[PDB]
Structure formats: structure tokens, C-alpha cells
Amino acid sequence: PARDRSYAWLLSWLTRHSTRTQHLSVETSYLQHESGRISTKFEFIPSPGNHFI
Amino acid sequence: LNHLLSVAPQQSLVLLEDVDAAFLSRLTFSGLLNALDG
């Protein structure tokens, strides 16, 4: 389930093991530090549906 | 001074102007440099 913390770990492991995943979603890590410093990074995650590995 | 210099925010610069006044003379001359090396 999404409540368990293994969800994100398994999804990251999937997106690493299967580099060429035609179907995927995006997770953006955005953090505006003090003094107006903006840090952004795109983490790509498998899209909802069926995937084969 | 040591507490303020130790708790400075991350990714932030600290500016200490008029450094001559404290060194010439709460106030201290060697205390500030000792605190800096802490």
C-alpha cells in the first residue's frame, strides 16, 4: 500500500532497473530555501497501469 | 557573539563591520578572535 514506506523505494528501484519505461509519471522535489534559493529536481516514476519487468 | 556566530543560518554570509572598535578596546579584543576560532 501507499501508506507503507516501501512504496516509494520499490517505485524508485523499478524506475532504475527498467531505464526504458515508455509509460511513466513525474515527481518534482521543489524547495525554496531562505534567501530565495530555489532547488528543483525531477524524479521519474512508473505511471499507473500495468508494467512488465 | 560566539552564540550568534554559531547559530548563523545555513547558506548565509555574516558581516561584522567596525571591527577596529572592539579590537581597540561586553567589549573585548581577544575574546572575539578566540570565539572565531571556536
From Swiss-Prot, chain A:
Disruption phenotype: Mice show phenotypes similar to the human GRACILE syndrome caused by defects in respiratory in mitochondrial respiratory chain complex III assembly. After three weeks of age, mice develop growth failure, hepatic glycogen depletion, steatosis, fibrosis, and cirrhosis, as well as tubulopathy, lactacidosis and short lifespan. It comes from the Eukaryota. It is found in: Mitochondrion inner membrane. Interacts with LETM1. Belongs to the AAA ATPase family. BCS1 subfamily. Chaperone necessary for the incorporation of Rieske iron-sulfur protein UQCRFS1 into the mitochondrial respiratory chain complex III. Plays an important role in the maintenance of mitochondrial tubular networks, respiratory chain assembly and formation of the LETM1 complex. This is Mitochondrial chaperone BCS1. It comes from Mus musculus.
